[PDB]
Amino acid sequence: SDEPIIYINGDYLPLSQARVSPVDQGFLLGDGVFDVVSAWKGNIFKLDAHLDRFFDSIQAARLNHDMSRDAWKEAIIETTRRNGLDDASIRFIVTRGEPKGVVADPRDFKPTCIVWVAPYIFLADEEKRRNGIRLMISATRGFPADTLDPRYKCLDRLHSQLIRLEALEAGYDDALWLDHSGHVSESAASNLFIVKNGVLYTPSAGILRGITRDTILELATELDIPWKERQLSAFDVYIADEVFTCSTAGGALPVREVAGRTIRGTTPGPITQAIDNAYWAMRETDRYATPLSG
Amino acid sequence: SDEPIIYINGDYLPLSQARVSPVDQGFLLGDGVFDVVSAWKGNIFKLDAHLDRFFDSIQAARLNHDMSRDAWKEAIIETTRRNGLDDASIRFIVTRGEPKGVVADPRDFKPTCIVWVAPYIFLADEEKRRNGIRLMISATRGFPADTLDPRYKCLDRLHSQLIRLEALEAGYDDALWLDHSGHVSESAASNLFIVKNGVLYTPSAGILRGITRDTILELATELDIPWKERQLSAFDVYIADEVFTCSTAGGALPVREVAGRTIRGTTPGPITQAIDNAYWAMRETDRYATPLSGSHHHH
Amino acid sequence: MSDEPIIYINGDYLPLSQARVSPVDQGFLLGDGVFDVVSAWKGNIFKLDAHLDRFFDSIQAARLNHDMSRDAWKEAIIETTRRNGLDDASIRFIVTRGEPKGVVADPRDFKPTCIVWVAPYIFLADEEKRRNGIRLMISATRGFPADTLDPRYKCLDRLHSQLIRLEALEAGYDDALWLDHSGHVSESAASNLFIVKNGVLYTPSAGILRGITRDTILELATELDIPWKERQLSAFDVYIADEVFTCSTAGGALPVREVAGRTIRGTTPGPITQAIDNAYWAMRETDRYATPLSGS
Amino acid sequence: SDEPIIYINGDYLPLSQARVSPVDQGFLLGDGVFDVVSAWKGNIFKLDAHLDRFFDSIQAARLNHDMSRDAWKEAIIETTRRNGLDDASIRFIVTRGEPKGVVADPRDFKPTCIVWVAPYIFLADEEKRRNGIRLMISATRGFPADTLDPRYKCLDRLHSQLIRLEALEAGYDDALWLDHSGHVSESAASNLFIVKNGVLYTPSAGILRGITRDTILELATELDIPWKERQLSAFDVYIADEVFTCSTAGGALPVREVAGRTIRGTTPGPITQAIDNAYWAMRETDRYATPLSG
Amino acid sequence: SDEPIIYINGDYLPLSQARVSPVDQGFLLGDGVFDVVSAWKGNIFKLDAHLDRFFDSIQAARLNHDMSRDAWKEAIIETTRRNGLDDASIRFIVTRGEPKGVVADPRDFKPTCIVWVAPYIFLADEEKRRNGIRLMISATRGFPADTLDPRYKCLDRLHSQLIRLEALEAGYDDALWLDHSGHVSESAASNLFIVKNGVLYTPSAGILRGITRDTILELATELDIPWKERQLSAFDVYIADEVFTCSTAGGALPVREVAGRTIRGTTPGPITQAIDNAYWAMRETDRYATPLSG
Amino acid sequence: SDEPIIYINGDYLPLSQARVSPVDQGFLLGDGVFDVVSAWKGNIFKLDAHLDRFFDSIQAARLNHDMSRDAWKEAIIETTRRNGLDDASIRFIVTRGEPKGVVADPRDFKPTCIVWVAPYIFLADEEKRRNGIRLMISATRGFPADTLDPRYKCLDRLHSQLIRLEALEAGYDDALWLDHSGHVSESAASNLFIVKNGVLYTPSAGILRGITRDTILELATELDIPWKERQLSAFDVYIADEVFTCSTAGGALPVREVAGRTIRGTTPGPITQAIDNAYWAMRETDRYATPLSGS
Ligand SMILES: *Cc1c(COP(=O)(O)O)cnc(C)c1O
Ligand SMILES: *Cc1c(COP(=O)(O)O)cnc(C)c1O
Ligand SMILES: *Cc1c(COP(=O)(O)O)cnc(C)c1O
Ligand SMILES: *Cc1c(COP(=O)(O)O)cnc(C)c1O
Ligand SMILES: *Cc1c(COP(=O)(O)O)cnc(C)c1O
Ligand SMILES: *Cc1c(COP(=O)(O)O)cnc(C)c1O
C-alpha cells in the first residue's frame, strides 16, 4: 500500500505497528535463524529449497516449534501478496522469543515468527553490475565450524557489519573473508565463484551453502560447463580468468578486481555472462516458480 | 503495576508498550553491544567501570552516538528508580538501529538505546551456591580474536544458547568453553578462577574481561592472596584445590565438579569463601558505590 | 568357550589367567604397540586379509616390523579362535616393542610381544538401542592431529578415548564422537560415522581410522546403487541429516536417533541405514571375504 | 645381583613372576598414569612432590582408587629396599586394571598398582654429560591440550618412541618437539632451559611440569639467577648463550648443539654449571629427603 | 668465450659483467618471482605452460610490467641459444627493481628481467636415481596460504635453505614438509607422489602446482593408471607401495625410505618405472617442444 | 648528488659500480639476513645492540663466516663516513653468496657482505608525524614461528611488499598484521605500542624484537611509566588511549586511527609525547653513541 506489511506471530500489521519485545531472545541474544527468498515478476523462486534450508537451520539450533512448514509457506506467500510487490526480497525469521519466566531453558520456548517483505534489491548499482565490482579480502576471518558454524543463516552478524565498515573505509564495494586455513570462503551476502581454463570453481567448506550457488551449479551442468567444489586461496582468485559473486540479492555479480589485482580479460567474462543469462532465463520458466497470483 | 519500566530512546515505557522494530539492525543482524551492572541495597556497584567497558565495546564496533556517558548514567539511575528496586540487574544496550537512508552505511545511523532493569539475580539457587555447581566443558569453542573478539559484550550469543542447550541435555549446571589452543576461557555469564597451593589463577586471553573478575583480583591483593593471569587447561581445573566462577549475576559461585572430576577438598574452599565474603563486605560499603537516592557525584 | 579364555602369546597357547605380559613390556609402560580386531560370525572370519593388511600398515608406520610372518599371524588368529571353541567371535591381535633388549633401548632393535585374544562376538549397544538408535554427543576433546599421533594408527594409546567415555557416561549419552581441530566430525573410539542426506551417503574423509566396516559400507552402497561421498562434515551436517549411523567390527551398522540434543528427523532406523545393515549381514551369511574356521 | 623385585597389587614378586594381564586396560588401551622418583646415596628426593603430581594425574584421569598416599609411599620405599639399592630410579604406575562387570564403565574399576625399581640412570654417557649432547627438533608436534594434555605423565608414549626412532636415524642424541604454535616444548624425558644475557628461560605451556624443572627454578632463585617462564621458538634456542635439559634421570644435561647450530660459548656454560653443581650439592644433603634407612 | 651468457633488461652479457644492483628490491626484499623450464636434446619442454605459471605469479604479486609474454618467450629461447646447451635448466626472473622515485610505491616500478641458462641438473646422482633416495620430514612447516602462499614460485626461500641445512645434518637426501594440519605437502624442488593398491596419489593443497606434477597426471591417464589429488599424512607415505618425487630438475625420482621407514617392495616400483619411462620417452619427442633452431 | 658509496666484500665502490651477481643466493633464494642502524647528528645509535641482533640472525641461519664483528663494525662506521652524512640509515647485509665448488651445501659458502648508507628516513611525512598516521589490519598474517620465524630480519619480504600494495590501495598509511591466533603483531618496518590507563603495552610474540622497541621499554622505566609485554587483539588497539609505532626509521610515530576506529583523545597523546621526547633527548647525548669522527 504505503507502509510495509509485516507478518508477526500470525498477525499482519503495518511495520510501524509491528513490535519485537526488547526482551525477545532474538534481540538480546541473537537467538534466531532466518532465510531470504525472492520474487521476480510475480513469481517466488525456489521457495521450497529456501524453506528446506530454513528448517535445517531450525533443526540445528533446536528451534523446532509448532508452526507447520505449510503455515510458513502460506505466510510467506500471503505477506508478499499483501505488500503488492511483484519484485521482492522476502525475509522470514524465527527466534526463541520472550522468556517463559526468569527460568530460561532454550528447549522450552514460544517462538517469534516474522515475515518481512521489501522491494527486490541488487548488491551493486547498474554501472557496477555491468562493469564489475571491486572486492577486498577482510582481516577478519570466518567463524570456525566448532564456534558458530557458517552453515547457519542466523541473526548473529555483527562480524560482517564490522567487515562492511572496513570495506567502506578502504573504498571497496564489499569484502570476502578467508577461513582460518587461509582459503577464501564467502562474503556476508554472497558466495564466490571463479573460472579458470573454462572450469568453474567454488569454495567447498566454511560457507553458507547458498541457494543461488546451488542454482549456478545446476545451470553450469545444463550448459556443459565443468565445475568443481574445492579449496581456493586468494591467489586462485587473483589469477582467475573470471570472478563473480552470487546471492538471492541480485543473482550473479561480476567482479573486476580483488585487492588491487585486476582480473584479467574483460569483465564480465563469457562464462559469467552465460550463467547470468541462464539464471534470469530460468526465472521466466515455471521451474521452481510459486506464483503470487496463481 | 509490577510491569517493568524500561528506558527506550529517551522515553520511559511499560515493557508491554516498549517496541523494537522488526527491521532494527540489533534484531536482524545482532548489530549492538550491551553491558550489565548491578545494584545492592540502594547502591549501584562499579557503574563507572561498566560504563567504561560499554563505551569500549561501542568504540570497537563504531557505534559512537550522541548520548554521552553521563546521559547513560542518568538513564541507568532513573530507570532503576522508576522500577522501585534497591537490588537490581541493569542491562543497557545500544544498537545500530533502523536503517537510515536508501543504502545502509553503518557509519551513518540513528541508535536504539535501551535500559532494562530487573530484580537482582544469581546464576544458581541457594543450595547450589552453598554446595557448589557442576560444570562441563563444551564441545563448542570460543570465538577466535580475529572473528568476533570475545572482548565484545554483544548481542551475538546464539553460540552460547546452543552451549546451554547441550549443558542442560547433559545434566550440568553450566558449561565452560575452551579457546582453539585447548585452554579454558570462560562461560557465557561468568569468568573462571581456580586455586592451587594458595595461589589464585585465572585465564589470560580469549575472554570478556569481567568487572567481577577485576574485583576478585583487587580483593585477592587486599587479602594478601597471590594471583596470576595465565593459560590454564582443563587439567589445571580438574586438579585444582578450589574452583569458582564469577559474574555480576551473583558474584563468586563455587564449583564442586567439572566434567566428572570432583574438585578435591571441601567446596566452597577457604580462599573461595574469603574472596566471596570480602566481595559482599565491599558492597555493604560505599566503595565504588553510586547511590540510587540523593546526589550521585562521588567525593 | 570355557570359563577360561585361551590366548596366543609369543607362540604359546595358554589360559588368559596364566598368560603374562611383563610389567616392563614397552607395550605396557609406553603404549609402544599396535593392534587390529577381526570378527567371526557363524563359523567364518570376515575380511581377515583386509584386517591383516591394515595391521601390517600400522606395523610398517611404527617400525614394528618383526619376524612373525603374515601367514603365521593368520594361522595364530584362526587357531586361537578354534582353541576357544567359538564360531562367533571378536578377535584382537596385538604386537608390541616388547621387553627391553640390550642396555640402551633403541626402537629399531627389539623382540616383539605377539598376542591373539579371542572373546565372544560383541555389539556396541543392547538390542533395544540397536532397534531404535543410540544417543551420541560431541566430545570436548578433539582427535589427534596427523602430526602428533596419526588417527590412522590402530594402537594401544587410548587414554584419550577412555576419558571421552567417562565424559559421555557422566553426560548420560551412549557414546561420543569427536571433531578434528578444524571442527569437522571425525569418528568415535570404536566406530566410524555415516550420515544420509537426500538419498546420498556421506562419511568423514580425514582425521580418522579407515575402518574396514566403513570400507564395506561403501562397497555395499555401490552394490545397492546408493550414491556416496567422502567429505568434510560438521556437527551441523549431522544434526540436519535424514539418517545417521555408526559402524564397527563390533556390531556392524548401529543407528543413531539423536546427537547432542538434536533428534534426527524421520524414523530411526532410516531406509538407507536398514538397506545397508541388511546387506552387510546378508553378505556375511555368504562366503564373500570368508575364511572358514573349519578350513573347508 | 638377582632379578628385580616388583611391587604389584600388594605383593612383592620377582619380575619373571610378576604378571600384567594381557587384558589389563593399561596394556590394551594405555589407561594408566605413572611417575618416577629417584634415590641418591640413601635418600629418595622430593618423594612428596612426585606423589602430589602422581595424584594430580590420577585425579584428572579419574583413576581414584583405594590405595592411600601413605601406602604408595610405603610401597615405593619397601620396593627399593627389597631390591638392595642405595641409588635408584623408581617408577610407580596405576592403571584402570582388568574390566570389572559386564559393561566397561571406567568409573567403576579395580586398579593395577605397580612399583618398578632399577639403579639410578642418566640420560647420556659420561662424555656427553661433560661436553654436551646434540638435539634436533622433531617433525612430530606435542599433543594439544584438548587432545591428550601434556600435563599427563601417562603410558601413552608411542608418539615419543617414534620421535626417538627419527632422532636415532638422524644421528642425534634426542629430539625436542614444538607445540602447534611453533614454540619449543620439551622432550620425552626432559624439560628444556636456555640462558640469554644472564637470564634463565624455560617454556611455559604445552609441557609436563617436571619436578627437576621446579627444582631448577628454586635453585636459580637461591643463586640470584633471574628466571622467566616464556614462549620460546627454535630461534631462541639457536641464539642462546647456554642450553640444557633436565630430568629425574640425571639432573641437568648440557646441550652443545641444536639442529646444526652449535650453541655459542663454552658448553657447559657458567650458569648451567652453577645450577648443576647446586642441584647435586642439594642432592648430597638431606633437603627434600626420605631416607631408605630410618 | 666459455662462460654463461645472461639476459638482463634487454642486454645479453657474460655472467661476469651482468649486474644486479645492491638496492634492487628483488635482492633487499625478495620482491620477485621466477620460473624454471628445461631443454632436452634441443627442445624446450612445455614453455607455454611455464610462461602461463610465471605470469600467474606476476599477476598475483602485482608485478605486471611492459615486457610482453612474446618478448619473454623470445628472450628465453635466444638466451638458451646463446649458451650452446642443448640440455639445460632455464630460469627466468622478474623483480620489482630499483626504487623508482622518492616514494617507494610497489605499484610504480621499473622491473629487473633476467634469464639465466645453466646445465640440465638431476637432483640425485645416477646411483641414487637407480636405488631411490632417502627423505625425511622437516620440523619446519610450509607457509600458510594467508602468509606467503605456496602457489608463488618466488625468491623467498631462506625457509627451504634452512630445511636443507637440517636435512644434510641429519644425513638425508632431501626433506619434505607438512602443512599446519600435518599433511604432507612438497619439498623445495619437487612435488610428492605415492602409489597404494594401484592408484597414484598426490597432495592437493598447500603446494606449488608443479608442471612436472601436471605431466605425471597426464601420463598416468595415458597409461590408464587411476590417480587422485588428496590430503596425505606421513603415515600414508610410510605404508605406500611406491613413493617418488618429481621436478623439472630430473623428472621423477624414486624414494626408497622416508624417516626411517623403508618403502615396501622393490624401488623403483612398477608404476614409478612406467611413469618415469613414459616421461623420458615424451621428452625425446617433439610433444610440447619449442625447438632451439639457429 | 655525489653517488652513494657501498661497502661490498671489502671494497668501497660507487653504487653504480657495486655488483650483486645474478646467481647470488641472496638474490635467487633470499638466503641472507640484514640489520639497519641509524646515525643522528654525527653519532651512530646502539651500534653494538644492532650488531648483537645481526649476529643472532647469522647464528640462527648458519650464516657464520670469517668477517669478524669488529670488521663489520669498522665497515659500518667507515662506509657511513665515506658517504659524508651525519644523519643516516645504514643497512648491513650478509648472504650465502655465489655457489662454491661443485654442489651447493649451505654449510660451506663464501658470503656476500654489504653496507649501504642512505639519508635518514622517517616513515611518514611531517604532517603525519605531527597529527598521526592511519593504519589498517592486513588480511595477510605473520609467519608462524615454525615456518620463517618473525625473529629473523631477513631478505624474504615479498609478504610485506604485498601488504604494502594492499594498504596503499585501501588508502591507509600502512598495515599491521596479526598472528594466526588473531593477536596484533607488528608492521613491516615497525613494532606496535598502545597505552591504556597509564600503562604501555606491546605484543609479546610473533614479532621482530626491535631495538627501538627495546629502547622504548628502557625509556618508559626511566620515566616511571609502567609497561607490559602481552598478547593484544585489534580490539585492544581500537579502544586504547594512545597508539604509536616505532622503528629505527623515524623513532616513535603516532597513530590517530586504526581500521576506521579513531583513537580517542588527542593524538599524539601525553605518554606518546613523553616517550618520543625522551627518545630524541637520549640521542642528543653520549648514550649508546658511536661518533663518526674518531673520538
Ligand atoms: C544468504 C547468504 C548467502 C547467499 O545465499 P543465497 O541462498 O544464494 O541467497 C551467502 N553467504 C552468506 C553468509 C549468506 O548469509
Ligand atoms: C558479562 C560476561 C561475563 C561476566 O562479566 P562481569 O563484568 O563480571 O559481569 C563473563 N563472561 C562473558 C562471556 C560475559 O558476557
Ligand atoms: C577400529 C576403530 C574403528 C572401527 O574400525 P573397523 O575396522 O570397522 O572395526 C573406528 N574408529 C576407531 C578410532 C577405531 O580404533
Ligand atoms: C617426566 C617427564 C619429564 C621430566 O620430569 P621430571 O619430573 O623432572 O623427572 C619431562 N618431560 C616429559 C614429557 C616427561 O614425561
Ligand atoms: C618449482 C617447484 C617445484 C617443481 O615444480 P616443476 O614445475 O615440476 O619444476 C615443486 N615444489 C616447489 C616448492 C617448487 O618451487
Ligand atoms: C626491523 C623491523 C622492525 C623495527 O626494528 P628496529 O630495530 O626498531 O628498527 C620492526 N618490525 C619488523 C618486521 C622489522 O623488520
PDB file of N, CA, C and O in Angstrom, chain D residues 181 183, chain E residues 141-144 146-149 156 159 180, chain F residues 140-152 154 156-160 163 177-180 185-186 205-207:
ATOM      1  N   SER D 181      51.839 -23.983  17.846  1.00  0.00           N
ATOM      2  CA  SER D 181      52.188 -22.604  17.524  1.00  0.00           C
ATOM      3  C   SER D 181      53.656 -22.450  17.162  1.00  0.00           C
ATOM      4  O   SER D 181      54.107 -21.328  16.924  1.00  0.00           O
ATOM      5  N   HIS D 183      56.303 -23.169  19.032  1.00  0.00           N
ATOM      6  CA  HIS D 183      57.198 -22.864  20.136  1.00  0.00           C
ATOM      7  C   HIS D 183      57.697 -24.139  20.795  1.00  0.00           C
ATOM      8  O   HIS D 183      57.009 -25.158  20.836  1.00  0.00           O
TER       9      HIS D 183
ATOM     10  N   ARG E 141      57.374 -26.217   8.867  1.00  0.00           N
ATOM     11  CA  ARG E 141      56.160 -26.394   8.078  1.00  0.00           C
ATOM     12  C   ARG E 141      56.165 -25.491   6.846  1.00  0.00           C
ATOM     13  O   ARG E 141      56.943 -24.543   6.735  1.00  0.00           O
ATOM     14  N   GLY E 142      55.317 -25.846   5.881  1.00  0.00           N
ATOM     15  CA  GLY E 142      55.086 -24.981   4.750  1.00  0.00           C
ATOM     16  C   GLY E 142      54.410 -23.691   5.168  1.00  0.00           C
ATOM     17  O   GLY E 142      53.847 -23.559   6.261  1.00  0.00           O
ATOM     18  N   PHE E 143      54.445 -22.715   4.269  1.00  0.00           N
ATOM     19  CA  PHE E 143      53.813 -21.438   4.544  1.00  0.00           C
ATOM     20  C   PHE E 143      52.296 -21.569   4.474  1.00  0.00           C
ATOM     21  O   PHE E 143      51.769 -22.100   3.480  1.00  0.00           O
ATOM     22  N   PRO E 144      51.558 -21.065   5.452  1.00  0.00           N
ATOM     23  CA  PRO E 144      50.103 -20.984   5.272  1.00  0.00           C
ATOM     24  C   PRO E 144      49.739 -20.139   4.061  1.00  0.00           C
ATOM     25  O   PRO E 144      50.432 -19.175   3.699  1.00  0.00           O
ATOM     26  N   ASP E 146      47.601 -17.857   3.764  1.00  0.00           N
ATOM     27  CA  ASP E 146      47.408 -16.467   4.104  1.00  0.00           C
ATOM     28  C   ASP E 146      48.647 -15.817   4.690  1.00  0.00           C
ATOM     29  O   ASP E 146      48.536 -14.814   5.383  1.00  0.00           O
ATOM     30  N   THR E 147      49.820 -16.367   4.400  1.00  0.00           N
ATOM     31  CA  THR E 147      51.098 -15.713   4.709  1.00  0.00           C
ATOM     32  C   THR E 147      51.817 -15.385   3.417  1.00  0.00           C
ATOM     33  O   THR E 147      51.640 -14.298   2.859  1.00  0.00           O
ATOM     34  N   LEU E 148      52.619 -16.312   2.938  1.00  0.00           N
ATOM     35  CA  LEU E 148      53.193 -16.262   1.602  1.00  0.00           C
ATOM     36  C   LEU E 148      52.757 -17.533   0.883  1.00  0.00           C
ATOM     37  O   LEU E 148      53.318 -18.600   1.122  1.00  0.00           O
ATOM     38  N   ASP E 149      51.754 -17.430   0.034  1.00  0.00           N
ATOM     39  CA  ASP E 149      51.078 -18.613  -0.492  1.00  0.00           C
ATOM     40  C   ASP E 149      52.070 -19.558  -1.162  1.00  0.00           C
ATOM     41  O   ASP E 149      52.878 -19.120  -1.998  1.00  0.00           O
ATOM     42  N   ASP E 156      61.771 -16.032  -2.238  1.00  0.00           N
ATOM     43  CA  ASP E 156      61.813 -16.001  -0.778  1.00  0.00           C
ATOM     44  C   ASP E 156      61.934 -17.421  -0.249  1.00  0.00           C
ATOM     45  O   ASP E 156      60.955 -18.060   0.132  1.00  0.00           O
ATOM     46  N   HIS E 159      63.640 -20.117   4.078  1.00  0.00           N
ATOM     47  CA  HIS E 159      62.896 -21.243   4.668  1.00  0.00           C
ATOM     48  C   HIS E 159      63.421 -22.596   4.187  1.00  0.00           C
ATOM     49  O   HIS E 159      63.771 -23.464   4.989  1.00  0.00           O
ATOM     50  N   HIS E 180      50.212 -27.055   8.135  1.00  0.00           N
ATOM     51  CA  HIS E 180      49.961 -26.926   9.556  1.00  0.00           C
ATOM     52  C   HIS E 180      48.868 -27.848  10.062  1.00  0.00           C
ATOM     53  O   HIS E 180      48.731 -27.995  11.281  1.00  0.00           O
TER      54      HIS E 180
ATOM     55  N   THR F 140      46.622 -10.518   5.361  1.00  0.00           N
ATOM     56  CA  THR F 140      47.749 -11.443   5.398  1.00  0.00           C
ATOM     57  C   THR F 140      48.268 -11.508   6.826  1.00  0.00           C
ATOM     58  O   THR F 140      48.462 -10.472   7.475  1.00  0.00           O
ATOM     59  N   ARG F 141      48.528 -12.723   7.304  1.00  0.00           N
ATOM     60  CA  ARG F 141      49.046 -12.922   8.647  1.00  0.00           C
ATOM     61  C   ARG F 141      50.569 -12.986   8.666  1.00  0.00           C
ATOM     62  O   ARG F 141      51.239 -13.161   7.642  1.00  0.00           O
ATOM     63  N   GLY F 142      51.113 -12.833   9.872  1.00  0.00           N
ATOM     64  CA  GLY F 142      52.527 -13.023  10.074  1.00  0.00           C
ATOM     65  C   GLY F 142      52.938 -14.465   9.860  1.00  0.00           C
ATOM     66  O   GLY F 142      52.116 -15.377   9.848  1.00  0.00           O
ATOM     67  N   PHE F 143      54.231 -14.671   9.710  1.00  0.00           N
ATOM     68  CA  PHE F 143      54.758 -16.028   9.565  1.00  0.00           C
ATOM     69  C   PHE F 143      54.691 -16.771  10.893  1.00  0.00           C
ATOM     70  O   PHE F 143      55.136 -16.241  11.916  1.00  0.00           O
ATOM     71  N   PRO F 144      54.157 -17.993  10.929  1.00  0.00           N
ATOM     72  CA  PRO F 144      54.308 -18.815  12.127  1.00  0.00           C
ATOM     73  C   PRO F 144      55.776 -19.013  12.452  1.00  0.00           C
ATOM     74  O   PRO F 144      56.636 -19.080  11.562  1.00  0.00           O
ATOM     75  N   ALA F 145      56.036 -19.233  13.740  1.00  0.00           N
ATOM     76  CA  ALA F 145      57.399 -19.412  14.217  1.00  0.00           C
ATOM     77  C   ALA F 145      58.068 -20.637  13.611  1.00  0.00           C
ATOM     78  O   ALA F 145      59.300 -20.677  13.496  1.00  0.00           O
ATOM     79  N   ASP F 146      57.280 -21.652  13.246  1.00  0.00           N
ATOM     80  CA  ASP F 146      57.804 -22.863  12.643  1.00  0.00           C
ATOM     81  C   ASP F 146      57.722 -22.835  11.129  1.00  0.00           C
ATOM     82  O   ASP F 146      57.724 -23.901  10.504  1.00  0.00           O
ATOM     83  N   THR F 147      57.637 -21.638  10.527  1.00  0.00           N
ATOM     84  CA  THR F 147      57.803 -21.506   9.088  1.00  0.00           C
ATOM     85  C   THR F 147      59.085 -20.684   8.828  1.00  0.00           C
ATOM     86  O   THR F 147      60.138 -21.277   8.593  1.00  0.00           O
ATOM     87  N   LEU F 148      58.996 -19.372   8.799  1.00  0.00           N
ATOM     88  CA  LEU F 148      60.150 -18.486   8.760  1.00  0.00           C
ATOM     89  C   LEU F 148      59.972 -17.552   9.957  1.00  0.00           C
ATOM     90  O   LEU F 148      59.157 -16.635   9.907  1.00  0.00           O
ATOM     91  N   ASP F 149      60.712 -17.797  11.035  1.00  0.00           N
ATOM     92  CA  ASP F 149      60.416 -17.154  12.306  1.00  0.00           C
ATOM     93  C   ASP F 149      60.431 -15.637  12.147  1.00  0.00           C
ATOM     94  O   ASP F 149      61.382 -15.094  11.579  1.00  0.00           O
ATOM     95  N   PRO F 150      59.425 -14.930  12.659  1.00  0.00           N
ATOM     96  CA  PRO F 150      59.471 -13.455  12.632  1.00  0.00           C
ATOM     97  C   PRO F 150      60.705 -12.863  13.274  1.00  0.00           C
ATOM     98  O   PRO F 150      60.982 -11.675  13.051  1.00  0.00           O
ATOM     99  N   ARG F 151      61.426 -13.624  14.094  1.00  0.00           N
ATOM    100  CA  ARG F 151      62.635 -13.104  14.729  1.00  0.00           C
ATOM    101  C   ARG F 151      63.749 -12.824  13.728  1.00  0.00           C
ATOM    102  O   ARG F 151      64.677 -12.066  14.039  1.00  0.00           O
ATOM    103  N   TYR F 152      63.698 -13.422  12.542  1.00  0.00           N
ATOM    104  CA  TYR F 152      64.672 -13.105  11.507  1.00  0.00           C
ATOM    105  C   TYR F 152      64.419 -11.723  10.932  1.00  0.00           C
ATOM    106  O   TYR F 152      63.296 -11.402  10.543  1.00  0.00           O
ATOM    107  N   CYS F 154      65.395 -10.529   7.687  1.00  0.00           N
ATOM    108  CA  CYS F 154      65.975 -11.206   6.538  1.00  0.00           C
ATOM    109  C   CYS F 154      65.429 -10.641   5.235  1.00  0.00           C
ATOM    110  O   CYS F 154      64.498  -9.829   5.217  1.00  0.00           O
ATOM    111  N   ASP F 156      63.609 -11.847   2.995  1.00  0.00           N
ATOM    112  CA  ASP F 156      62.427 -12.513   2.454  1.00  0.00           C
ATOM    113  C   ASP F 156      61.178 -11.741   2.843  1.00  0.00           C
ATOM    114  O   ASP F 156      60.484 -12.073   3.800  1.00  0.00           O
ATOM    115  N   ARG F 157      60.898 -10.677   2.080  1.00  0.00           N
ATOM    116  CA  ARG F 157      59.859  -9.716   2.449  1.00  0.00           C
ATOM    117  C   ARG F 157      58.855  -9.453   1.329  1.00  0.00           C
ATOM    118  O   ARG F 157      58.152  -8.435   1.361  1.00  0.00           O
ATOM    119  N   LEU F 158      58.726 -10.357   0.354  1.00  0.00           N
ATOM    120  CA  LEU F 158      57.644 -10.227  -0.613  1.00  0.00           C
ATOM    121  C   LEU F 158      56.299 -10.123   0.097  1.00  0.00           C
ATOM    122  O   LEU F 158      55.432  -9.339  -0.318  1.00  0.00           O
ATOM    123  N   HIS F 159      56.138 -10.897   1.169  1.00  0.00           N
ATOM    124  CA  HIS F 159      54.991 -10.869   2.085  1.00  0.00           C
ATOM    125  C   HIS F 159      54.605  -9.438   2.444  1.00  0.00           C
ATOM    126  O   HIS F 159      53.466  -8.997   2.216  1.00  0.00           O
ATOM    127  N   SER F 160      55.550  -8.679   2.962  1.00  0.00           N
ATOM    128  CA  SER F 160      55.175  -7.342   3.395  1.00  0.00           C
ATOM    129  C   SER F 160      55.099  -6.350   2.237  1.00  0.00           C
ATOM    130  O   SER F 160      54.388  -5.341   2.352  1.00  0.00           O
ATOM    131  N   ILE F 163      51.528  -6.684   1.320  1.00  0.00           N
ATOM    132  CA  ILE F 163      50.742  -5.991   2.335  1.00  0.00           C
ATOM    133  C   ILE F 163      50.747  -4.487   2.077  1.00  0.00           C
ATOM    134  O   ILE F 163      49.725  -3.808   2.240  1.00  0.00           O
ATOM    135  N   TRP F 177      49.913  -6.492  10.873  1.00  0.00           N
ATOM    136  CA  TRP F 177      49.369  -7.824  10.709  1.00  0.00           C
ATOM    137  C   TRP F 177      49.213  -8.495  12.061  1.00  0.00           C
ATOM    138  O   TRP F 177      49.845  -8.118  13.044  1.00  0.00           O
ATOM    139  N   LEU F 178      48.333  -9.487  12.082  1.00  0.00           N
ATOM    140  CA  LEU F 178      48.121 -10.376  13.211  1.00  0.00           C
ATOM    141  C   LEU F 178      48.866 -11.690  13.024  1.00  0.00           C
ATOM    142  O   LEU F 178      49.242 -12.066  11.908  1.00  0.00           O
ATOM    143  N   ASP F 179      49.038 -12.403  14.134  1.00  0.00           N
ATOM    144  CA  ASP F 179      49.450 -13.797  14.085  1.00  0.00           C
ATOM    145  C   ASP F 179      48.221 -14.677  13.887  1.00  0.00           C
ATOM    146  O   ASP F 179      47.088 -14.205  13.787  1.00  0.00           O
ATOM    147  N   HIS F 180      48.447 -15.982  13.782  1.00  0.00           N
ATOM    148  CA  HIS F 180      47.338 -16.845  13.417  1.00  0.00           C
ATOM    149  C   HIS F 180      46.376 -17.093  14.564  1.00  0.00           C
ATOM    150  O   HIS F 180      45.303 -17.657  14.328  1.00  0.00           O
ATOM    151  N   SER F 185      50.560  -8.218  15.814  1.00  0.00           N
ATOM    152  CA  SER F 185      52.000  -8.460  15.888  1.00  0.00           C
ATOM    153  C   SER F 185      52.790  -7.170  15.667  1.00  0.00           C
ATOM    154  O   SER F 185      53.317  -6.586  16.622  1.00  0.00           O
ATOM    155  N   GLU F 186      52.883  -6.723  14.419  1.00  0.00           N
ATOM    156  CA  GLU F 186      53.781  -5.636  14.045  1.00  0.00           C
ATOM    157  C   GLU F 186      53.446  -5.218  12.621  1.00  0.00           C
ATOM    158  O   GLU F 186      52.510  -5.743  12.002  1.00  0.00           O
ATOM    159  N   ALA F 205      54.823 -11.768  21.296  1.00  0.00           N
ATOM    160  CA  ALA F 205      55.270 -12.885  20.479  1.00  0.00           C
ATOM    161  C   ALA F 205      54.987 -12.629  19.009  1.00  0.00           C
ATOM    162  O   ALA F 205      54.233 -11.726  18.634  1.00  0.00           O
ATOM    163  N   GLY F 206      55.626 -13.443  18.169  1.00  0.00           N
ATOM    164  CA  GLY F 206      55.397 -13.382  16.738  1.00  0.00           C
ATOM    165  C   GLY F 206      55.898 -12.125  16.069  1.00  0.00           C
ATOM    166  O   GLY F 206      55.329 -11.703  15.057  1.00  0.00           O
ATOM    167  N   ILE F 207      56.970 -11.532  16.590  1.00  0.00           N
ATOM    168  CA  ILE F 207      57.480 -10.253  16.115  1.00  0.00           C
ATOM    169  C   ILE F 207      58.992 -10.299  15.985  1.00  0.00           C
ATOM    170  O   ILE F 207      59.676 -11.145  16.580  1.00  0.00           O
TER     171      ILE F 207
END
